[PDB]
């Protein structure tokens, strides 16, 4: 690694890490390439190295297989250049040879691996055509080249050809597409209905054999077999289970001792697949029945099953564990046989219980078996990964279902996706509906009781020190709102108004700015909503973060021009000379125009950044681990050791002196240079750009540290007043002289324009202030000899001497700490610093220096960067503006973008990928306390600390674990109020960042150093709740919209939704609301937008449960883990003895099961003994049936329409089905009605409408809206 | 640890336990995909993870291919990444070139100081002689690069 | 020819191509001639060479059926 690729005269050269031009065969970064004696690279040709004859590809130049004509003859070769023997090879033109034992190609007919193939006179393989080998005529397949039956059109009549090349007479024969035909004694294909060998087949107009096709063929119904297309009468019932009684001598023994929670393991009264129960008696040791004692629980599946399919699987599985004769049982097996077999397994079970003196072994056997079954694992949960589903595999929305699951009813709350732009639900039908579901258990923030609890938490954090240590200096000052677009936007108003009430943030800039607060608000329309609502918290500015991506930070070669930073479209016709603002553009552009910002037009206050803990970090760091085989998927679970190893590669790539970056970001110093000089923004700095993102906190600085540190201290000293920004560029494309080098300038304290010469207040602060920034994205940039580049430092800086702070070159970026050690340069009369291709600068006393305006490439830059400041700056010079106590504004708003707000800098002082502390002394917050000084002097006014909440860790109740959780970063937590408290046994129990004391000391230390502390407010979700409940759940995408092809709708599901109730959420939950309602009544009386209601503190949340949640990620338990009778579709329950529903076997009643005919029709009874009504039922041979409300199977009559419309208790199944005379539902096939119209019915039996439909043989058909087939 | 073809000519791979593989799997160098039922995807695209990958008709192996997105041809490499500033093939065997903006190029094109000829359809033409710069030019059988 | 005779132990086994210089091939044919005359004296016979030449000659496409367009359709099925 570490050598660049260069192109000279049309050819690729490779120059080493050494700096040497490369000849010969070389494996460079896992690719095998060759360079001739001049050092040019070879593509699409063969070369000889050692005794190897190696071909290299024509695109890539990479070693791969080919055929060379060597002397007279063809010879195959592999990737390493070895002559191939007894192998296929494809050559450059996609042609195929087979070389034998001697390396010589086979010619003519041959058989290989049981496949018959042909080769032309040159040894090339014939594919996709006929061929007259010998006397006969054979077709060979397109890709494999294998001999197969095919048809060709001779004269105007189709003819058939078999695999041996013989024409077909009196038989069926296929074509390559997959259609079967039949050809008579005279070789001609047959049409229409045909009876051959005592069986009848249906061939359409085209002569295609139709299989799984229902139609009235003799004027009498006929279904054509899916296997061979042979017509059955569909009069014989296909079900193989007659009505039988199940009761026997064991029934009363295995029956439940009680029909209630005593004798049944349950959740909210319901039963699950792995429920154990208390049978009346126990066949102890397989010998003697003995009454059971309370502790003698046994698995429900020893005695009961939902259907015969499941029963048969259980028996086979338990057999395989040594418990019985190993058996192949199917759903077709007679019920009697299965039940007898279940008892001999029961016997064996009781024997192994006595032998082992344990039931744990069984628990584990049952668990294993249960997850085998599709209804009891994720397969019935429709895992998907598009959208935010990418994180966890998909989501379930809980439903208000007072009849079945009343503890889980939310009281008609659960308004989903009430993001800012959809706070009133007016975009619920569009993509403008918010993605309410993100991670773990999503909290219902549309419920006023929950809203009140979020405020209690908010108060708790803002007064954390007062509450937990009676230390009024250990309290958080502001907040970051995590996942704004995934929650009900009411939370913003709740938070905003709280800050107004307690801190008078809407009074003045000084009050507002004392409690700096930010939003993670990614939607492109969030900034303007936030501004309409008075900027209670600062929006992010993605438009600038975005442009850094395109123009500097992301990629090599192609990048958007620096021109794009201007957003000239801001002005009408992009006329910088005339500068008329465009009042009505397509709602686009960068948030704050900086072409000529004199502070005269008000703008939206904001924070901005280059990177974040969750931007340009998470993905790169994992791509690095993937690329080095440490994990396979982005979602994969990894250990800390796995992370540390991957981090070494990430670091190695970051600091690569080559200057190329695979995972890391380019031009970071240059990006920060712009960020930290921009007017009308509060910049934020990412810990991971200053120190390494892995390992210990502040363990090692990054390579960018000194440059960014310098920029930061200089920002205090020089950054103030108006701004200008221009580029040596007019658009996408560059004219001759043009460099596309950007120039950004700030003038000084009261100087707002280029041409302004002095302040209005006649303060002189401005003279030694101001700054010049030049940046390029082109590391191969070379200037014309004529060309000059100019920084208009302004007419307030005529004839002044300026000195460099920071200058790029070919080995790095030099940083100058003071005026003396840096090159100076003086401005002209108009105040411009002029630069040429070649420059000769003079130090103020020390020396004379040479410097080229040259694009460079190294670890610290891929482009140009120069920063210049005025010499003669005082030691304590401070260009910041303090915020005023006066009520400047009656606009209602909290924050205002001005010089005072711009005097802030936020430091996001953590990384998600930090290692766990090796010792108490190195914990992040311990370190922050000792190092607070350092950040004061970089100008940080607010320190954004990680989320301090106790990690849910490795705990995982089902479904996909997330990295937040297993990396303990604090975004995944179980207890919202536990910020590092000790165990109740007295022992320390720090978070990743340290104990609660460590945190309070860290916060105080920041206040002692004049900095604020930001609390991460995470209201969207909570992880790993230990208590289970039964919810009613529907499968949904991020926006809470039901998946289109899902039968998982309003199903009962066991979720983990209930908190421990003996945690810190229980201690501190709701406590402070009463105090606050008394003190600030209006907060509790003010209506919220999304609900029309005020917050409701009448109910306190000490323990979470499902009624307060919108849903969960899928937990891999199954759609029917909660047990149900297929016949009535009623779920089993034992909560209240007045409304018990169990299988009759467990109640020692007689459960009859099977199909039984009577004069009216056919009825069916489930294993649990109940009659099928208004439900679909599947028999042991895989056929499906529908039983109407009356309890009778639907079946077609002679002369009547077989198509029947169904409306069932199970709504998802509603639709039009085709039932045959024996009740069988047609599936995945065409069905004719009484009138001769054809329809199609899908995988699940439903009619299909208004779409084209494809065939495995490439036949296409169309179905009209009314269902009929146009074809 | 073997492939099996069923009645319909569909293909599964069963692992060490006899149980079918699901999702993305690497058999030796070869990269393949398997649906939720364990069936091997052959002759079609597939959105595995973040990216989008075409799998070959009979081998089922991951390879470069082109599809028409909106009204413009786009190129897809073997890793499922769309192609920008490079040549990429399609399964048929044609090579195309896609510029910085991902759009296929047409006509005579000079790239990295060499000249290649792309026809109306965007196919790179090899072993093609013609008066291209108003001056004779033979395009290489190897790489399609113009020689004098 | 040079490659074939080489493979029988008569010279350094070689990949020679039509691209190889005429000079090199002619030099190499003589070192093969030398090796040939040695095995003629050593064996006191030329039959071994007759069989070697026969074999080599049929190696070449112009001197075997490949330039004869073997076919088997019609009565050509009998003898090619
Ligand atoms: O054992 C499997 C199979 O092997 C051969 O067919 C493979 C394959 O060959 C061709 O495609 C290969 C591909 O190779 C390089 O990438 C070339 O540069 C390409 O042009 C070329 O397409 C052929 O096009 C395919 O149809 C074929 O599937 C044997 O031919 C088979 O008999 C054998 O079963
Ligand atoms: Ca949410």
Q: Nearest C-alpha to atom 22 of ligand 1 is from which residue?
A: A94
Class of domain A543-903: alpha beta
**How far, in Å, are A625, A645, A902 from residue A650 at the CA level?**
8, 9, 34
Phi-psi region of A814 (alpha: psi -120 to 50; beta: other; left: phi over 0): beta
Q: Under a CB-based contact definition with an 8 Å cutoff, are residues A350 and A282 in contact?
A: yes
Q: How far is the CA of A99 from the centre of ligand 1 (A)?
A: 14
CA distances from A1271 to A184, A987, A1243, A1262 (A): 28, 76, 20, 5
Q: Which residues surround ligand 2, an ion (CB under 5 A)?
A: A 436, 442, 486-487, 1020
Can you tell me the distance from the alpha carbon of A119 to that of A103, in angstroms, rounded to the nearest whole number?
15
**Distance between CA atoms of residues B23 and B10, nearest Å:** 16
Determine whether the interchain pair A59/B89 forms a contact, defined as Cβ–Cβ distance below 8 Å.
Answer: yes
CA distance readout (Å), A377 to A307, A374, A772, A959, A1118: 17, 5, 62, 10, 4
Q: How far apart are CA A1241 and CA A1250, in angstroms?
A: 13
Rounded-to-integer distance, Cα A210 and Cα A224, Å: 7
- Alpha helices (runs of H) in A943-1072, residue ranges in sequence order: 963-966, 996-1008, 1064-1068
Spacing of C-alpha A1006 from chain mean position:
36
Closest to A392 in 3D by CA, of A437, A336, A354, A352: A437
Find all residues with CB under 8 Å of A171, minimum gap 6, and list them.
Answer: A182, A183
Phi and psi at A246, nearest 5°, equal: -105, -20
Method: X-ray
Beta bridge partners of A284: A288
CA of A286 to the centre of ligand 2 (A): 54
DSSP category for residue C7: I
Which of A71, A134, A135 comes nearest C17 by C-beta? A71
Q: Is A385–B85 a contact, with Cβ atoms under 8 angstroms apart?
A: no
Nearest alpha carbon to residue A683 among A747, A748, A592 = A592
Q: Which of A94, A143, A634 sits opposite B58 (nearest CB)?
A: A143
Strands (E), A747-822: 771-775, 788-792, 801-808, 813-815
C touches B, CB cut-off 8 Å, minimum 3 pairs: no
- Tokens in use for A1048? 């998982």
Distance between CA atoms of residues A715 and A637, nearest Å = 42
Instruction: Say if residue A444 carries a ligand binding annotation.
Output: no
Contacts of A286 (CB under 8 A, 6+ apart): A347, A348, A350, A351, A354
| Whole-number Å distance between alpha carbons of A777 and A562 | 7
CA distance A381 to A254: 33
**d(C-alpha A965, C-alpha A952), whole Å:** 6
Burial status of residue A102 (CB atoms within 10 A of its CB: 0-12, 13-18, 19 or more)? exposed
DSSP for A209-229?
Answer: BP-SEEEESSSSEEEE-TTT-
Biggest alpha carbon–alpha carbon distance for chain A: 116
Closest protein CA for atom 8 of ligand 1: A143
What DSSP line would sit under A463-486, residue for residue? THHHHHHS-TTS---EEEETTGGG
Which among A71, A121, A132 is the nearest to C73, CB-wise? A132
Euclidean distance between CA atoms A1041 and A430, whole angstroms = 10
In 3D space, the residue among A1196, A1195, A1240 whose CA is nearest the CA of residue A1216 turns out to be: A1240
**Closest ligand to residue A1109's CA:** 2
Non-local CB neighbours of A106 within 8 Å, separated by 6+ positions: A98, A99, A100, A119, A123
| Residue of B49, B75, B88 to mutate, interface with A, max A Cβ within 10 Å | B49
Q: Which ligand is nearest to the CA of B3?
A: 1
Measure CA A843 to chain center.
Answer: 54
Residue C60 and residue A71: Cβ atoms within 8 Å? no
- Cα–Cα distance between A168 and A189 in angstroms, integer? 10
- Note every long-range contact of C17-20, with CB atoms under 8 Å and residues 24 or more positions apart, other chains counting: C17/A71, C18/A71
Distance CA A1126, CA B115 (A): 71
- Is A497 flagged in the annotation as binding? no
Taking the centre of ligand 1 as the mean of its atom positions, its distance from the CA of residue B72, in whole angstroms, is: 28
Contact between B58 and A9 using a beta-carbon 8 Å cutoff: no
Is residue A411 within 8 Å of residue A380, measured between CB atoms?
A: no
Sheet strands (E) in A39-125? 46-49, 52-55, 66-70, 73-77, 87-90, 96-99, 110-112, 115-117
Query: For residue A242, which of A1183, A1164, A1151, A1159 has the smallest C-alpha distance?
Result: A1164
d(CA A594, CA A565): 9
Segment (H or E) for A1036: strand A1027-1036
Q: Are A43 and B95 in contact (CB < 8 Å)?
A: no
Q: Which residue has the tokens 């790539």?
A: A653
E strands, A1042-1197, are: 1051-1058, 1109-1113, 1152-1157, 1162-1165, 1175-1178, 1184-1187
Ligand 1 neighbours (beta carbon < 6 A): A 88, 90, 92, 94, 96, 125, 143-145; B 58, 93
Alpha-carbon distance A1147 to A1124, whole Å? 16
Residue A377 to chain B, least CA–CA distance (Å): 13
**Chain A residue with Cα closest to C75:** A135
- Contact (CB<8Å) B112/A10: yes
Q: Measured in whole angstroms, how far is the alpha carbon of residue A590 from the centre of its chain?
A: 28
Distance A385 CA to ligand 2 centre (A): 18
If one counts every other C-beta atom within 10 angstroms of the C-beta of residue A802, the result is 24
Written as one string, the DSSP assignment of B68-94 is EETTEEEEE-TTSPBP-SEEEE-TTS-
Phi-psi region of A965 (alpha: psi -120 to 50; beta: other; left: phi over 0): alpha
**What is the distance, to the nearest Å, from the Cα of residue B13 to the centroid of all Cα atoms in its chain?**
24
What's the rounded Cα separation, in Å, for the pair A539 and A591? 11
Question: A1154, A290 in Cβ contact below 8 A?
Answer: no
- 3-class secondary structure for A273-292? CCCEECECEEEECCCEEEEC
Resolution of the experimental model, in Å, one decimal: 3.5
Judge whether A736 is annotated as a binding position. no
Chain C residues touching residue A134 (CB < 8 angstroms): 72, 77
Q: Which atom belonging to ligand 1 lies closest to the Cα atom of A117?
A: 32
- Neighbouring residues of A114: CB distance < 8 A, sequence distance ≥ 6: none
With touching defined as 3 or more inter-chain CB pairs under 8 Å, the answer for chains A and B is yes
* Cβ contact A557:A516 at 8 Å: no
Chain C contact set for A72 (CB, 8 A): 60-61
List, as own/partner pairs, every contact residues A817-821 make where C-beta atoms lie below 8 angstroms and the sequence separation is at least 24, other chains included: A817/A710, A819/A844, A819/A871, A819/A872, A819/A873, A820/A844, A820/A845, A820/A846, A821/A846
SS3 A739: coil
User: How many Cα atoms sit within 13 Å of A36 on the Cβ side?
Assistant: 9
Q: Are A4 and A658 in contact (CB under 8 A)?
A: yes
Pairwise CA distance, residues A1204 & A1188, whole Å: 11
d(CA A425, CA A434): 9
- Six-digit token string for A729: 């560029």
Residue A623 CA to residue A435 CA, distance in Å, equals 26
**A100 in Cβ contact with A91 (< 8 Å):** no
- SS3 category, A858: strand
């Amino acid at each position: 690694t570490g050598g660049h690729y260069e192109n000279h005269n049309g050819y690729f050269v490779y120059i080493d890490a050494s700096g040497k031009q490369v000849t010969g065969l070389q494996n460079i970064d896992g690719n095998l390439q060759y360079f001739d004696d001049n050092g040019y690279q070879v593509k699409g040709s063969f070369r000889d190295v050692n005794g190897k004859h190696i071909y290299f590809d024509s695109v890539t130049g990479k070693a791969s297989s080919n055929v060379d004509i060597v002397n007279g003859k063809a010879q195959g070769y592999d990737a390493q250049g070895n002559q191939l023997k007894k192998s296929y090879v494809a050559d450059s033109s996609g042609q195929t040879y087979y070389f034998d034992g001697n390396g010589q190609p086979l010619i003519g007919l041959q058989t290989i691996d049981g496949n018959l193939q042909y080769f032309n006179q040159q040894g090339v393989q014939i594919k996709g055509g006929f061929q007259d080998v010998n006397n006969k005529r054979i077709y060979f397949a397109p890709n494999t080249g294998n001999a197969v039956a095919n048809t060709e059109i001779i004269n105007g009549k189709l003819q058939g050809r078999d695999a041996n090349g013989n024409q077909v007479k009196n038989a069926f024969s296929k074509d390559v597409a997959g259609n079967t035909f039949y050809f008579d004694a005279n070789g001609v294909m047959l049409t229409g209905l045909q009876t051959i060998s005592g069986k009848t087949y249906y061939l359409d107009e085209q002569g295609h054999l139709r299989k799984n096709y229902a139609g009235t063929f003799n004027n009498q119904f006929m279904y054509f077999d899916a296997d061979t297309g042979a017509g059955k009468t569909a009069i014989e019932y296909q079900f193989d289970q007659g009505l039988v009684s199940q009761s026997n001598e064991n029934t009363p023994h295995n029956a439940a001792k009680s029909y209630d929670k005593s004798s049944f393991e349950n959740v909210d009264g319901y039963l699950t697949a792995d429920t154990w129960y208390r049978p009346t008696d126990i066949l102890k040791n397989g010998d003697t029945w003995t009454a059971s004692t309370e502790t003698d629980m046994r698995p429900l599946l020893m005695t009961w099953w939902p259907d015969k399919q499941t029963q048969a699987n259980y028996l086979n599985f338990m057999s395989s564990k040594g418990l019985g004769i190993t058996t192949t049982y199917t759903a077709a097996t007679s019920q009697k046989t299965l039940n007898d077999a279940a008892f001999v397994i029961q016997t064996a079970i009781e024997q192994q219980i006595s032998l082992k003196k344990s039931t744990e072994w069984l628990r584990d056997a049952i668990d294993s078996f249960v997850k085998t079954q599709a209804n009891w694992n994720k397969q019935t949960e429709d895992e998907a990964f598009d959208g935010l589903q990418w994180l966890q595999g998909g989501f379930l929305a809980y439903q208000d279902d007072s009849h079945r699951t009343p503890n889980t009813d939310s009281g008609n709350n659960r308004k989903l996706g009430r993001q800012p732009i959809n706070i009133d639900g007016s975009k619920d039908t569009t993509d403008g509906k918010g993605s309410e579901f993100l991670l773990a258990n999503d909290i219902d923030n549309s419920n006023p009781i929950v809203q009140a609890e979020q405020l209690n938490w908010l108060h708790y954090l803002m007064n954390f020190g007062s509450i937990t240590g009676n230390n009024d200096n250990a309290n958080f000052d502001g907040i970051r709102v995590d996942a704004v677009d995934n929650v009900d936007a009411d939370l913003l108003k709740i938070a905003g108004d709280y800050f107004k009430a307690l801190y008078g943030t809407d009074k003045s800039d000084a009050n507002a700015n004392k409690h700096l607060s930010i939003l993670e608000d990614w939607n492109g329309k969030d900034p303007q909503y936030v501004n309409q609502q008075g900027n209670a918290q600062l929006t992010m500015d993605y438009t600038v973060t975005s442009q850094f991506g395109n123009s500097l930070t992301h990629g090599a070669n192609n990048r958007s021009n620096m021109w794009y930073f201007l957003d000239t479209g801001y002005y009408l016709n992009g006329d910088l000379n005339k500068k008329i603002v465009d009042k009505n553009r397509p709602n686009s552009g960068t948030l704050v125009n900086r072409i000529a910002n004199s502070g005269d037009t008000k703008v939206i206050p904001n924070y901005s950044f280059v990177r974040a803990h969750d931007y340009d970090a998470q993905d790169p760091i994992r791509k690095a681990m993937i690329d080095h085989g440490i994990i396979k998927n982005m979602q994969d679970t990894f250990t800390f050791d796995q992370l540390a190893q991957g981090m070494e590669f990430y670091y190695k790539d970051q600091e690569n002196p080559s200057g190329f970056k695979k995972y890391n970001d380019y031009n970071l110093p240059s990006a920060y240079a712009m960020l930290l000089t921009n007017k009308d923004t509060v910049p934020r700095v990412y810990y991971g750009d200053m120190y390494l993102e892995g390992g210990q906190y502040m363990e090692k600085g990054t390579i960018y540290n000194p440059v960014i540190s310098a920029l930061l201290k200089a920002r205090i000293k020089y950054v103030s007043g108006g701004q200008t920004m221009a580029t040596d560029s007019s658009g996408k494309d560059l004219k001759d002289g043009e460099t596309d080098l950007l120039t950004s300038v700030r003038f000084g304290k009261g100087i707002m324009t280029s041409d302004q010469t002095t302040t209005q207040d006649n303060s002189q602060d401005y003279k030694n202030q101001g700054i010049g920034v030049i940046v390029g994205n082109n590391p191969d940039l070379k200037l014309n000899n004529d060309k000059t580049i100019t920084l208009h430092m302004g007419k307030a800086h005529k004839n002044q001497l300026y000195r460099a702070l920071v200058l790029s070159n070919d080995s790095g970026i030099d940083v100058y700490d003071s005026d003396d050690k840096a090159p100076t340069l003086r401005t002209n009369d108009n105040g411009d610093l002029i630069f040429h291709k070649t420059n000769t600068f003079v130090k103020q006393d020390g020396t004379i220096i040479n410097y080229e305006m040259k694009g460079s490439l190294n670890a610290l830059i891929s482009g140009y960067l120069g920063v210049w400041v005025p010499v003669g700056a005082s030691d304590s010079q401070d260009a910041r503006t303090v915020a005023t106590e006066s009520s400047s504004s009656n606009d209602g708003s909290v924050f205002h973008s001005n010089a005072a707000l711009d005097s802030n800098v936020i430091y996001e002082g953590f990384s998600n990928f930090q290692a766990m502390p090796t010792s108490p002394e190195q914990s992040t917050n311990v370190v922050i306390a000792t190092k607070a000084n350092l950040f004061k002097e970089l100008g940080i006014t607010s320190f954004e600390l990680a989320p301090q909440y106790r990690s849910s860790g490795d705990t995982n109740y089902g479904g996909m674990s997330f990295l937040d959780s297993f990396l303990n970063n604090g975004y995944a937590f179980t207890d919202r109020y536990d910020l590092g408290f000790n165990k109740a046994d007295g022992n320390p129990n720090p978070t990743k960042y340290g104990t609660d004391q460590d945190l309070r000391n860290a916060i105080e230390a920041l206040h002692k150093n004049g900095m604020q502390a930001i609390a991460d407010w995470v209201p969207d979700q909570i992880y790993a709740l230990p208590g289970k409940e039964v919810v009613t759940a529907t499968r949904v995408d991020e926006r809470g919209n039901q998946l289109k092809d899902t039968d998982f709708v309003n199903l009962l599901y066991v979720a983990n939704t209930k908190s421990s109730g003996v945690d810190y959420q229980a201690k501190y939950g709701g406590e402070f609301l009463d105090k606050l309602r008394e003190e600030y009544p209006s907060l509790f009386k003010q209506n919220q937008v999304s609900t029309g209601q005020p917050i409701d503190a009448s109910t306190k949340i000490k323990q979470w449960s499902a009624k307060y949640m919108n849903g969960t990620n899928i937990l891999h338990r199954g759609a029917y883990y909660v047990l149900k009778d297929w016949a009535t579709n009623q779920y089993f329950n034992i909560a209240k003895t007045n409304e018990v529903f169990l299988p009759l076997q467990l109640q020692n009643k007689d459960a009859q099961t099977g199909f039984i005919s009577d004069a009216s029709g056919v009825k069916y009874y489930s294993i649990s003994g109940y009659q099928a009504k208004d439900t679909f039922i599947e028999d042991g041979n895989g056929n499906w049936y529908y039983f109407d409300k009356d309890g009778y199977m639907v079946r077609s009559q002679q002369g009547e329409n077989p198509i029947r419309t169904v409306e069932t208790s199970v709504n998802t199944r509603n639709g039009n089905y085709y039932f045959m005379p024996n009740g069988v539902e047609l599936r995945k096939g065409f069905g004719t009605d009484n009138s001769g119209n054809v329809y199609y019915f899908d995988d699940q039996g439903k009619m299909v409408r208004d779409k084209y439909i494809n065939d495995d043989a490439n036949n296409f058909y169309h179905l009209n809206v009314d269902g009929t087939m146009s074809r």
